[PDB]
Amino acid sequence: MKLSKDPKAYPGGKNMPAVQVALRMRKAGRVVKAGSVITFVITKQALSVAERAHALNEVMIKSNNLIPDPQYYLEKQIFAPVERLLER
Amino acid sequence: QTPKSSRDTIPSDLSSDTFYHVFGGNSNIFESFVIQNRIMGPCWLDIKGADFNSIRNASHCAVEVSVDKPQNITPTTTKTMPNLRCLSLSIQTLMNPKENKQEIVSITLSAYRNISLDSPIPENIKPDDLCTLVRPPQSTSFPLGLAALAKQKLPGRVRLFNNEKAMLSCFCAMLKVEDPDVIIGHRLQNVYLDVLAHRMHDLNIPTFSSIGRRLRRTWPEKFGNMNHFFISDICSGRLICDIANEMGQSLTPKCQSWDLSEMYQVTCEKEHKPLDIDYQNPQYQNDVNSMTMALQENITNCMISAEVSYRIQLLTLTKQLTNLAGNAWAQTLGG
Amino acid sequence: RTMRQNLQEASDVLDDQIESFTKIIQNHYKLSPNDFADPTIQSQSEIYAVGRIVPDSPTYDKFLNPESLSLETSRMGGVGRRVRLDLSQVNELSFFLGQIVAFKGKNANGDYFTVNSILPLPYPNSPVSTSQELQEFQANLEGSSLKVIVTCGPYFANDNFSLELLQEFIDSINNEVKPHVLIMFGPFIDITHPLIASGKLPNFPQFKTQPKTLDELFLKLFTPILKTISPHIQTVLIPSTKDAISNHAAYPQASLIRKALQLPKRNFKCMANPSSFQINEIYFGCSNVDTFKDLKEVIKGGTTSSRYRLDRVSEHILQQRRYYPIFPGSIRTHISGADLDVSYLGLTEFVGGFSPDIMIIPSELQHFARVVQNVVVINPGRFIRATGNRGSYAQITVQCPDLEDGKLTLVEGEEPVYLHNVWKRARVDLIAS
């Protein structure tokens, strides 16, 4: 997800997972500005979808204890496209 | 040409007690010349009474002649044509946030000097010359080792320049010395020729006229919709063959976005993964490898544009359409 | 007209807004159409552009900022494409969603339109009158000044159905003030009234037969009371979209049917919402949607921020040449809202392109009466407050026209006409109800 603007100026950044990830890296110390491409994975633990989003490299590291959230990927990523694919 | 009031035309609704309409008052001169002498697109012309001593330092062309009356020029029946000097342009830009100005960082020029339309062009023709000019996107200096690493990795010549201005001066000089007949590129017409022309304007490039074949020492007064007319007039002499314009799009209905990689895949059945080069990134001022990869992407874009131009038969199809309609070749290519 | 909404027709109206404002700008600033180009595509020459203010994302936060706006172009201008705005080079401005604007700018890299300067839409021409008409009005007034009273709903409190304050006001206007005209805005029986909303409507001991519908409640509660208004006082009834008596809940709103309200013909006139009308020479512009509360600005610059909000909003209304320029319409979350019928936004434009001499836009905000761009803008406030305390109403007294006193300005031309100067001649009082 590409950031059109600064994450701190995004309207409703609490709903965009990419904005949450970018702000997490900002608070961590790493720099991120407009145009930066945020690669993330929705993870499993109520927390919001954006709150559970973490950067891709963080999820790869097994010792971090992070896995793709089934519900989200089975509903919004797999269920959503097929229903238009097999509508008729 | 009249001694006085040459720019004043007769309105069709001219008041008179003997006539009540006038046709042809606002005739265009090219239209009159083409209509009267029955010229049908590019063809051989027999020209009698050519004055070889009248024209002094008026063009970038090798031979300069003139005629006193258009009736001295008649079209011939020869079907063959000379080989065309084609030049492929790939332009890499940089978005300046301060003034919101689009700035040129590099050019790759690929030369095809014997492109013959009488015979099919072969697949994967190689250029007779390949050169790339670059300027530093951030500082006045490049990352160290750029010249040797470019010699060791990149095909063709690579020339380094300290700033943009000398870089476009060298571009203009190379265009003059090459003297190509057709300029090849992707989305040149309404993006990259605009960027190029206005960067030549902003940096006050004195040899800017070399993008066409006429020699002008100064820009038009109103340079600064008329922009399209001004650039098309400046470029006159070198046909602009754009593969993604309306003409190029009409020959490739099987594309959807007409991006350079998509056109490459659709027309040549080859895959190229596009790199999103952003020169605003600070890494391009100290990382030589990133700069070399960006230049390689520019170069491969240039040859991909040239190859897609040859494959879809843009030049030959536009030519034939021009001979069939009787208009100018440039109008068919860019209209 | 029925309750139909067509996306193509609404889009046609929204396009026509931009086209008409483009032609108006070209005429006012004497600019050729070749000077105007498409701002959504990259150009390296500075161009003129006209469009609508919209959020840069269709799903946008309730609060906008100067870094999150776009310009929507017309069908001919930019094939309907929307371009982000770069306003870093503009220090002073005030925008709102649905405003039509004119820009001198430059789209260099394709993703941002940089505004270098603003092209303020010119203020509409004021109405004019001939000498003969002004002398006829002079004779009509018999020397004395013109008195017009304006009241706005709600007329009874939230916890009862008492119109005792209304009866007091009617007696006052009948026997002391004695105005020429009285303009009453809705809502009369507001349908968002919590007792009406919850069905908590009690038996009324003062009615022989209880009402069975809100319409009969109006006929039994208001119409006796309104009938006591003196017949020498012509009164104007202007609805609101929340009026229960109206069967047209969309703005622009058709006028009430006077016969259905059982009000006598002698001095009762029902006018549409909005409506523009003349009282003697005076041009009235009346709209019953709270533009002042609804229009939320994005602002940069100390100069504009130091200005009163009300003057800025009134100048916006004048420039947009339409009484409710915000879009999309405001919403009350579902309970009520603007209820804009976008297909007929033509009817809410200034009639004939003239800027009304006095513009009345009632608001839930505090009552105010102000002169902005030589136009008197009046908000008389609500007649009665929620708790039942005294509200307010506005009295407009205008000096009788006189060609000799000089306060009317002659307009040069072969045919002599005179600009009304109401702001020079009108005194507006906001009186506790």
Side-chain angles (χ1 to χ4, degrees), chain A residues 1-4 6-51 53-88, chain B residues 1-55 57-78 80-94 96-99 101-152 154-192 194-225 227-335, chain C residues 1-28 30-43 45-61 63-83 85-105 107-147 149-200 202-278 280-294 296-299 301-325 327-330 332-433:
Chain A
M1 262 316 277
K2 198 173 190 176
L3 271 201
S4 308
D6 251 342
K8 284 182 174 176
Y10 255 102
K14 292 287 178 178
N15 289 337
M16 288 86 98
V19 175
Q20 296 297 275
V21 174
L23 292 168
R24 189 175 300 110
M25 326 193 302
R26 276 266 189 78
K27 184 145 284 180
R30 266 160 183 172
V31 64
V32 54
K33 298 282 166 179
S36 300
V37 181
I38 307 297
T39 314
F40 72 71
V41 175
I42 302 298
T43 74
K44 188 172 189 297
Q45 312 181 227
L47 295 175
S48 177
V49 157
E51 289 182 76
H54 291 49
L56 164 55
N57 48 5
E58 312 193 353
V59 182
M60 321 305 258
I61 297 160
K62 295 180 182 181
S63 55
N64 281 324
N65 181 7
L66 299 165
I67 64 92
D69 192 1
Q71 176 65 23
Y72 172 88
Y73 279 94
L74 287 167
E75 178 183 347
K76 305 201 51 144
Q77 287 282 328
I78 309 168
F79 172 25
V82 290
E83 292 275 61
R84 61 177 292 276
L85 279 186
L86 38 64
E87 183 181 356
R88 304 149 200 288
Chain B
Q1 308 159 291
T2 53
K4 84 181 285 293
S5 59
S6 60
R7 201 172 63 85
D8 283 307
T9 63
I10 291 159
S12 60
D13 58 336
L14 185 65
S15 182
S16 211
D17 312 1
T18 41
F19 58 82
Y20 67 102
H21 195 84
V22 186
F23 289 106
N26 64 328
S27 301
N28 198 37
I29 170 184
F30 170 79
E31 150 187 359
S32 296
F33 168 70
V34 152
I35 275 180
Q36 290 170 18
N37 311 5
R38 298 167 286 282
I39 310 297
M40 301 294 277
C43 70
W44 282 99
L45 297 174
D46 275 335
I47 304 186
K48 54 203 61 63
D51 273 298
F52 291 82
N53 297 309
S54 171
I55 318 304
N57 205 68
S59 72
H60 305 287
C61 307
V63 200
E64 306 174 343
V65 317
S66 69
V67 292
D68 61 326
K69 53 214 175 198
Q71 300 71 1
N72 288 348
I73 304 171
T74 59
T76 83
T77 60
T78 306
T80 61
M81 72 224 78
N83 284 217
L84 290 169
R85 289 192 142 230
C86 301
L87 163 154
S88 184
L89 286 198
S90 192
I91 272 297
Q92 303 254 310
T93 88
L94 163 70
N96 158 284
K98 291 186 176 183
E99 302 108 330
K101 230 185 221 173
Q102 189 172 354
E103 257 143 21
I104 302 153
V105 55
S106 73
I107 321 97
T108 293
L109 306 89
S110 187
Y112 310 80
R113 289 157 181 168
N114 86 89
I115 299 298
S116 179
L117 303 185
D118 201 344
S119 301
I121 305 170
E123 273 81 39
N124 176 232
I125 220 170
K126 281 83 173 168
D128 303 273
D129 185 78
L130 181 63
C131 163
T132 305
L133 323 173
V134 306
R135 59 138 178 101
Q138 312 290 12
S139 72
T140 55
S141 62
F142 288 106
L144 285 151
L146 182 57
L149 203 161
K151 174 175 176 290
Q152 183 176 97
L154 300 178
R157 319 174 22 189
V158 176
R159 303 184 68 176
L160 311 185
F161 300 88
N162 315 66
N163 56 78
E164 196 176 353
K165 180 162 170 56
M167 181 285 258
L168 299 320
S169 289
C170 179
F171 177 29
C172 261
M174 278 202 130
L175 245 199
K176 195 202 196 315
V177 307
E178 170 146 0
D179 194 16
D181 299 302
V182 182
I183 289 167
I184 274 285
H186 180 265
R187 288 173 179 159
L188 290 180
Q189 185 174 355
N190 55 15
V191 200
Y192 303 91
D194 299 336
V195 174
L196 184 65
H198 309 131
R199 288 311 292 159
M200 313 177 153
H201 182 173
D202 289 320
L203 311 156
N204 192 22
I205 284 295
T207 52
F208 70 93
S209 74
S210 61
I211 66 200
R213 302 212 208 171
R214 336 191 62 267
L215 206 144
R216 332 183 182 195
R217 299 295 300 278
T218 197
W219 293 77
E221 312 89 320
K222 258 72 182 190
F223 211 79
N225 296 339
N227 187 31
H228 187 95
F229 173 70
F230 286 133
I231 45 176
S232 180
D233 189 27
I234 292 164
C235 292
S236 296
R238 308 189 201 283
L239 302 173
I240 286 272
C241 155
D242 193 348
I243 39 171
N245 66 2
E246 192 156 320
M247 191 35 88
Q249 290 173 23
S250 276
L251 300 184
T252 88
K254 334 163 281 304
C255 289
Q256 298 183 67
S257 68
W258 285 278
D259 257 6
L260 187 51
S261 59
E262 192 211 35
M263 311 205 58
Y264 186 12
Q265 269 269 109
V266 168
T267 70
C268 329
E269 322 275 19
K270 276 281 177 68
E271 152 175 10
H272 162 228
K273 176 221 172 282
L275 290 169
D276 194 345
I277 305 299
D278 200 358
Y279 294 90
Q280 295 184 95
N281 197 271
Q283 83 177 351
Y284 285 107
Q285 85 185 52
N286 287 320
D287 196 333
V288 63
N289 196 256
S290 301
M291 281 186 68
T292 321
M293 301 143 38
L295 297 188
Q296 174 60 86
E297 172 70 4
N298 190 55
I299 292 163
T300 180
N301 284 346
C302 184
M303 270 76 58
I304 284 170
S305 302
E307 183 60 27
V308 170
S309 310
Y310 300 147
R311 196 71 67 91
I312 65 178
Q313 302 175 123
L314 182 49
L315 279 295
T316 39
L317 275 168
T318 50
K319 164 163 92 63
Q320 288 297 309
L321 287 169
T322 302
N323 305 65
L324 281 84
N327 59 42
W329 204 350
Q331 165 61 30
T332 278
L333 279 161
Chain C
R1 59 186 181 277
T2 199
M3 173 206 317
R4 59 172 292 179
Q5 271 218 299
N6 187 327
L7 196 37
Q8 176 59 229
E9 187 170 337
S11 63
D12 293 308
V13 156
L14 296 163
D15 189 43
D16 288 347
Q17 282 178 7
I18 295 167
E19 294 172 358
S20 315
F21 267 105
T22 297
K23 294 167 9 203
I24 284 157
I25 279 285
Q26 306 171 331
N27 292 324
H28 190 64
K30 305 285 180 113
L31 306 161
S32 84
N34 290 283
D35 313 308
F36 291 71
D38 187 356
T40 69
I41 69 179
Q42 32 272 54
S43 82
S45 181
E46 161 159 51
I47 69 145
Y48 279 66
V50 184
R52 164 180 293 100
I53 308 300
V54 295
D56 70 354
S57 177
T59 36
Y60 66 106
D61 275 354
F63 287 120
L64 280 314
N65 57 54
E67 290 83 25
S68 79
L69 288 182
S70 291
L71 188 66
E72 175 185 44
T73 65
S74 75
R75 310 173 140 171
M76 161 155 158
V79 196
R81 286 185 306 262
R82 308 179 163 205
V83 61
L85 317 201
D86 172 20
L87 314 105
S88 72
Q89 280 105 300
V90 179
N91 297 334
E92 170 209 11
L93 61 83
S94 172
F95 296 147
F96 67 97
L97 303 187
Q99 188 190 351
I100 318 294
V101 299
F103 289 137
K104 204 208 192 177
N107 192 327
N109 65 82
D111 315 351
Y112 272 93
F113 194 50
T114 307
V115 288
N116 292 318
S117 52
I118 177 62
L119 271 112
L121 334 158
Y123 292 105
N125 294 326
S126 290
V128 295
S129 296
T130 63
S131 66
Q132 141 165 13
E133 296 159 313
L134 289 153
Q135 312 314 80
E136 304 256 8
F137 305 147
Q138 215 175 270
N140 277 6
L141 286 176
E142 284 164 24
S144 61
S145 309
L146 182 54
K147 215 162 293 162
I149 294 169
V150 287
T151 63
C152 306
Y155 279 97
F156 53 81
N158 284 256
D159 57 348
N160 61 41
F161 297 89
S162 161
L163 298 153
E164 295 154 306
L165 195 66
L166 183 61
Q167 293 168 321
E168 181 180 1
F169 168 82
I170 287 174
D171 313 310
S172 203
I173 72 154
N174 281 352
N175 306 128
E176 294 93 302
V177 183
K178 290 178 161 185
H180 297 91
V181 201
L182 164 70
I183 297 116
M184 301 145 68
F185 290 79
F188 294 93
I189 48 184
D190 191 335
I191 208 164
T192 63
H193 186 217
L195 298 178
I196 303 301
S198 57
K200 290 188 178 277
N203 80 313
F204 294 95
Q206 77 273 16
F207 303 153
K208 185 194 169 148
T209 306
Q210 294 306 311
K212 299 181 181 291
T213 298
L214 265 182
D215 294 321
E216 281 123 7
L217 183 52
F218 182 88
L219 298 171
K220 284 152 163 312
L221 190 31
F222 268 95
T223 301
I225 283 157
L226 302 176
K227 267 187 171 84
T228 70
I229 293 159
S230 164
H232 300 308
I233 288 130
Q234 178 168 338
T235 193
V236 171
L237 311 180
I238 300 175
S240 158
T241 89
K242 295 141 202 84
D243 265 300
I245 59 189
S246 286
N247 73 321
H248 195 231
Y251 179 77
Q253 172 171 27
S255 71
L256 298 69
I257 297 137
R258 176 193 58 79
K259 314 141 180 293
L261 321 183
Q262 279 181 30
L263 262 165
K265 173 160 189 76
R266 284 171 291 291
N267 69 315
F268 284 109
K269 296 276 186 192
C270 295
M271 301 216 168
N273 172 38
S275 48
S276 282
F277 49 96
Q278 340 180 21
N280 279 357
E281 79 281 356
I282 216 154
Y283 270 51
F284 275 147
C286 299
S287 77
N288 207 9
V289 198
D290 197 339
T291 311
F292 283 97
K293 186 196 22 160
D294 279 338
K296 291 151 190 333
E297 297 159 284
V298 317
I299 306 193
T303 295
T304 180
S305 282
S306 67
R307 174 171 220 201
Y308 294 81
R309 177 166 172 283
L310 303 167
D311 287 352
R312 209 161 41 233
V313 174
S314 308
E315 284 187 344
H316 272 300
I317 294 162
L318 292 178
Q319 283 167 9
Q320 303 321 132
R321 214 161 290 91
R322 174 204 321 113
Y323 295 106
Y324 200 170
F327 186 64
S330 176
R332 190 78 82 170
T333 36
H334 193 96
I335 298 158
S336 52
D339 285 338
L340 298 184
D341 185 2
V342 177
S343 285
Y344 294 94
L345 281 192
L347 308 173
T348 77
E349 304 215 280
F350 285 176
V351 160
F354 294 120
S355 175
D357 295 317
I358 324 173
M359 216 218 312
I360 314 182
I361 302 175
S363 172
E364 261 156 19
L365 296 177
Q366 187 173 246
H367 53 59
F368 64 80
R370 274 181 91 151
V371 180
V372 196
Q373 303 292 18
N374 298 342
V375 178
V376 182
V377 188
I378 303 178
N379 158 353
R382 291 160 138 193
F383 183 32
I384 208 164
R385 291 159 176 178
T387 55
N389 273 346
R390 275 175 214 292
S392 58
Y393 66 108
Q395 183 173 355
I396 329 167
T397 312
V398 192
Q399 271 84 70
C400 158
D402 198 340
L403 304 176
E404 293 201 312
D405 289 346
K407 290 180 179 179
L408 298 171
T409 308
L410 59 87
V411 159
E412 293 177 350
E414 292 177 350
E415 300 195 331
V417 309
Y418 301 117
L419 282 159
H420 325 143
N421 288 338
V422 172
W423 57 280
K424 296 181 178 193
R425 289 194 287 119
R427 194 172 141 280
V428 282
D429 326 303
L430 305 155
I431 295 155
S433 53

Tab-separated table of all heavy atoms in Angstrom, chain C residues 105-135, unseen atoms left out:
chain	number	residue	atom	x	y	z
C	105	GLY	N	-3.203	28.018	-12.096
C	105	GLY	CA	-2.282	27.068	-11.512
C	105	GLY	C	-1.508	26.303	-12.557
C	105	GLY	O	-1.424	26.712	-13.716
C	106	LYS	N	-0.944	25.177	-12.128
C	106	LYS	CA	-0.041	24.403	-12.962
C	106	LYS	C	0.074	22.993	-12.411
C	106	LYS	O	0.430	22.805	-11.246
C	106	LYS	CB	1.337	25.064	-13.021
C	107	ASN	N	-0.226	22.011	-13.252
C	107	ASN	CA	-0.089	20.596	-12.913
C	107	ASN	C	1.184	20.094	-13.588
C	107	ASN	O	1.186	19.793	-14.784
C	107	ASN	CB	-1.317	19.812	-13.363
C	107	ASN	CG	-1.360	18.409	-12.795
C	107	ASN	OD1	-0.326	17.777	-12.592
C	107	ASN	ND2	-2.562	17.911	-12.546
C	108	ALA	N	2.268	19.994	-12.818
C	108	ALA	CA	3.569	19.740	-13.427
C	108	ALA	C	3.859	18.251	-13.549
C	108	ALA	O	4.239	17.775	-14.626
C	108	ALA	CB	4.667	20.419	-12.622
C	109	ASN	N	3.711	17.502	-12.460
C	109	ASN	CA	4.133	16.113	-12.444
C	109	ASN	C	2.993	15.116	-12.578
C	109	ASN	O	3.249	13.907	-12.579
C	109	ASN	CB	4.938	15.815	-11.167
C	109	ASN	CG	4.112	15.946	-9.910
C	109	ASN	OD1	3.385	15.027	-9.534
C	109	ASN	ND2	4.225	17.090	-9.244
C	110	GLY	N	1.745	15.578	-12.701
C	110	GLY	CA	0.612	14.738	-13.025
C	110	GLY	C	-0.286	14.415	-11.847
C	110	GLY	O	-1.471	14.123	-12.049
C	111	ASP	N	0.248	14.459	-10.628
C	111	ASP	CA	-0.499	14.052	-9.445
C	111	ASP	C	-0.922	15.214	-8.553
C	111	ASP	O	-1.599	14.983	-7.549
C	111	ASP	CB	0.324	13.053	-8.621
C	111	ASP	CG	0.968	11.980	-9.476
C	111	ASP	OD1	0.654	11.903	-10.681
C	111	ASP	OD2	1.791	11.210	-8.939
C	112	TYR	N	-0.554	16.450	-8.885
C	112	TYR	CA	-0.897	17.577	-8.031
C	112	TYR	C	-1.102	18.828	-8.868
C	112	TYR	O	-0.299	19.142	-9.750
C	112	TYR	CB	0.185	17.826	-6.981
C	112	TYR	CG	-0.013	17.032	-5.717
C	112	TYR	CD1	0.587	15.795	-5.552
C	112	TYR	CD2	-0.808	17.516	-4.691
C	112	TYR	CE1	0.404	15.063	-4.397
C	112	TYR	CE2	-0.999	16.795	-3.534
C	112	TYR	CZ	-0.391	15.568	-3.391
C	112	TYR	OH	-0.579	14.844	-2.236
C	113	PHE	N	-2.183	19.549	-8.572
C	113	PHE	CA	-2.470	20.837	-9.189
C	113	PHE	C	-2.090	21.932	-8.205
C	113	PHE	O	-2.706	22.061	-7.146
C	113	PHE	CB	-3.942	20.954	-9.585
C	113	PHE	CG	-4.233	22.111	-10.505
C	113	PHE	CD1	-3.476	22.319	-11.645
C	113	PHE	CD2	-5.260	22.994	-10.223
C	113	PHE	CE1	-3.743	23.383	-12.486
C	113	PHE	CE2	-5.530	24.056	-11.064
C	113	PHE	CZ	-4.771	24.251	-12.194
C	114	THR	N	-1.078	22.713	-8.562
C	114	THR	CA	-0.554	23.758	-7.693
C	114	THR	C	-1.255	25.070	-8.003
C	114	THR	O	-1.121	25.602	-9.108
C	114	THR	CB	0.950	23.912	-7.885
C	114	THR	OG1	1.578	22.638	-7.731
C	114	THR	CG2	1.518	24.885	-6.863
C	115	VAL	N	-1.984	25.598	-7.030
C	115	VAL	CA	-2.686	26.859	-7.217
C	115	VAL	C	-1.716	28.003	-6.934
C	115	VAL	O	-1.153	28.100	-5.839
C	115	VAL	CB	-3.932	26.931	-6.324
C	115	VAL	CG1	-4.994	25.990	-6.852
C	115	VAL	CG2	-3.593	26.541	-4.895
C	116	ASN	N	-1.490	28.850	-7.935
C	116	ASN	CA	-0.642	30.017	-7.740
C	116	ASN	C	-1.443	31.224	-7.274
C	116	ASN	O	-0.945	32.024	-6.473
C	116	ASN	CB	0.115	30.354	-9.028
C	116	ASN	CG	1.149	29.305	-9.389
C	116	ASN	OD1	1.870	28.805	-8.527
C	116	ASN	ND2	1.231	28.973	-10.672
C	117	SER	N	-2.677	31.369	-7.751
C	117	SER	CA	-3.533	32.462	-7.322
C	117	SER	C	-4.983	32.014	-7.374
C	117	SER	O	-5.331	31.037	-8.039
C	117	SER	CB	-3.326	33.719	-8.177
C	117	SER	OG	-3.437	33.425	-9.557
C	118	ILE	N	-5.866	32.746	-6.689
C	118	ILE	CA	-7.321	32.403	-6.726
C	118	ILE	C	-8.049	33.387	-7.649
C	118	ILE	O	-7.627	34.556	-7.707
C	118	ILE	CB	-7.923	32.405	-5.307
C	118	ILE	CG1	-9.427	32.125	-5.325
C	118	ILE	CG2	-7.601	33.706	-4.591
C	118	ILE	CD1	-9.796	30.771	-5.886
C	119	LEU	N	-9.096	32.926	-8.339
C	119	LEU	CA	-9.901	33.821	-9.213
C	119	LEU	C	-11.298	33.984	-8.604
C	119	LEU	O	-12.223	33.278	-9.049
C	119	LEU	CB	-9.985	33.212	-10.614
C	119	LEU	CG	-8.859	33.602	-11.568
C	119	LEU	CD1	-7.970	32.405	-11.869
C	119	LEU	CD2	-9.424	34.188	-12.852
C	120	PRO	N	-11.489	34.880	-7.612
C	120	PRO	CA	-12.782	35.023	-6.938
C	120	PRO	C	-13.942	35.247	-7.913
C	120	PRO	O	-13.866	36.170	-8.701
C	120	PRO	CB	-12.592	36.290	-6.093
C	120	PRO	CG	-11.108	36.323	-5.817
C	120	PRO	CD	-10.478	35.800	-7.090
C	121	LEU	N	-14.978	34.409	-7.834
C	121	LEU	CA	-16.178	34.622	-8.685
C	121	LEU	C	-16.755	35.999	-8.351
C	121	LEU	O	-16.931	36.289	-7.153
C	121	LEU	CB	-17.202	33.518	-8.408
C	121	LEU	CG	-16.632	32.195	-7.899
C	121	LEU	CD1	-17.702	31.399	-7.171
C	121	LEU	CD2	-16.049	31.382	-9.044
C	122	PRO	N	-17.047	36.860	-9.347
C	122	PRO	CA	-17.536	38.215	-9.080
C	122	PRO	C	-18.892	38.203	-8.361
C	122	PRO	O	-19.648	37.271	-8.564
C	122	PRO	CB	-17.716	38.810	-10.482
C	122	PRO	CG	-17.869	37.604	-11.381
C	122	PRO	CD	-16.943	36.571	-10.777
C	123	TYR	N	-19.165	39.233	-7.554
C	123	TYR	CA	-20.437	39.307	-6.858
C	123	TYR	C	-21.545	39.682	-7.840
C	123	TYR	O	-21.345	40.544	-8.700
C	123	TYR	CB	-20.362	40.326	-5.730
C	123	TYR	CG	-19.453	39.894	-4.609
C	123	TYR	CD1	-18.198	40.459	-4.455
C	123	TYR	CD2	-19.838	38.901	-3.723
C	123	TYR	CE1	-17.358	40.062	-3.444
C	123	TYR	CE2	-19.004	38.499	-2.702
C	123	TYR	CZ	-17.765	39.081	-2.569
C	123	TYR	OH	-16.925	38.689	-1.553
C	124	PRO	N	-22.718	39.065	-7.728
C	124	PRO	CA	-23.783	39.315	-8.703
C	124	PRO	C	-24.271	40.753	-8.657
C	124	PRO	O	-24.172	41.447	-7.644
C	124	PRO	CB	-24.896	38.350	-8.285
C	124	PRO	CG	-24.581	37.944	-6.906
C	124	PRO	CD	-23.121	38.125	-6.674
C	125	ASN	N	-24.804	41.195	-9.793
C	125	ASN	CA	-25.329	42.545	-9.912
C	125	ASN	C	-26.542	42.736	-9.007
C	125	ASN	O	-27.320	41.812	-8.757
C	125	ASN	CB	-25.713	42.841	-11.360
C	125	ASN	CG	-24.515	42.874	-12.281
C	125	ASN	OD1	-23.425	43.287	-11.887
C	125	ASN	ND2	-24.710	42.440	-13.520
C	126	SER	N	-26.690	43.949	-8.515
C	126	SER	CA	-27.828	44.287	-7.679
C	126	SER	C	-29.015	44.706	-8.537
C	126	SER	O	-28.839	45.229	-9.640
C	126	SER	CB	-27.472	45.418	-6.712
C	126	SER	OG	-26.565	44.968	-5.720
C	127	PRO	N	-30.238	44.484	-8.063
C	127	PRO	CA	-31.410	44.918	-8.826
C	127	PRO	C	-31.507	46.434	-8.881
C	127	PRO	O	-30.983	47.147	-8.023
C	127	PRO	CB	-32.580	44.312	-8.045
C	127	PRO	CG	-32.055	44.187	-6.656
C	127	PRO	CD	-30.624	43.785	-6.829
C	128	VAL	N	-32.185	46.925	-9.918
C	128	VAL	CA	-32.372	48.350	-10.140
C	128	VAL	C	-33.844	48.613	-10.435
C	128	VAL	O	-34.598	47.714	-10.807
C	128	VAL	CB	-31.490	48.882	-11.285
C	128	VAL	CG1	-30.021	48.776	-10.921
C	128	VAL	CG2	-31.781	48.122	-12.569
C	129	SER	N	-34.246	49.872	-10.265
C	129	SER	CA	-35.618	50.285	-10.516
C	129	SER	C	-35.629	51.622	-11.238
C	129	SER	O	-34.687	52.411	-11.136
C	129	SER	CB	-36.428	50.398	-9.221
C	129	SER	OG	-36.562	49.137	-8.590
C	130	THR	N	-36.711	51.864	-11.971
C	130	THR	CA	-36.906	53.128	-12.658
C	130	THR	C	-37.408	54.193	-11.686
C	130	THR	O	-37.791	53.906	-10.550
C	130	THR	CB	-37.897	52.967	-13.811
C	130	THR	OG1	-39.174	52.577	-13.295
C	130	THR	CG2	-37.408	51.909	-14.786
C	131	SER	N	-37.390	55.443	-12.151
C	131	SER	CA	-37.898	56.538	-11.332
C	131	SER	C	-39.386	56.378	-11.052
C	131	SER	O	-39.839	56.584	-9.919
C	131	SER	CB	-37.626	57.873	-12.019
C	131	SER	OG	-38.378	57.987	-13.215
C	132	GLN	N	-40.160	55.993	-12.071
C	132	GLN	CA	-41.610	55.894	-11.924
C	132	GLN	C	-41.990	54.896	-10.837
C	132	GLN	O	-42.855	55.170	-9.998
C	132	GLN	CB	-42.243	55.501	-13.260
C	132	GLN	CG	-43.397	54.516	-13.141
C	132	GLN	CD	-44.223	54.417	-14.407
C	132	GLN	OE1	-43.819	54.899	-15.465
C	132	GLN	NE2	-45.386	53.782	-14.306
C	133	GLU	N	-41.345	53.729	-10.837
C	133	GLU	CA	-41.661	52.707	-9.845
C	133	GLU	C	-41.346	53.195	-8.438
C	133	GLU	O	-42.119	52.958	-7.499
C	133	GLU	CB	-40.891	51.426	-10.163
C	133	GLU	CG	-41.281	50.792	-11.492
C	133	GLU	CD	-40.209	49.867	-12.039
C	133	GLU	OE1	-39.027	50.269	-12.052
C	133	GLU	OE2	-40.550	48.741	-12.456
C	134	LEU	N	-40.215	53.883	-8.270
C	134	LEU	CA	-39.861	54.413	-6.960
C	134	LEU	C	-40.849	55.476	-6.498
C	134	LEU	O	-41.178	55.531	-5.308
C	134	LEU	CB	-38.436	54.964	-6.986
C	134	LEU	CG	-37.333	53.905	-7.075
C	134	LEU	CD1	-36.087	54.477	-7.729
C	134	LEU	CD2	-37.007	53.333	-5.702
C	135	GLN	N	-41.344	56.318	-7.410
C	135	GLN	CA	-42.370	57.284	-7.020
C	135	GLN	C	-43.674	56.588	-6.640
C	135	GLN	O	-44.372	57.025	-5.717
C	135	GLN	CB	-42.611	58.300	-8.136
C	135	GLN	CG	-41.351	58.912	-8.734
C	135	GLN	CD	-40.346	59.363	-7.690
C	135	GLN	OE1	-39.597	58.556	-7.139
C	135	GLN	NE2	-40.314	60.663	-7.427
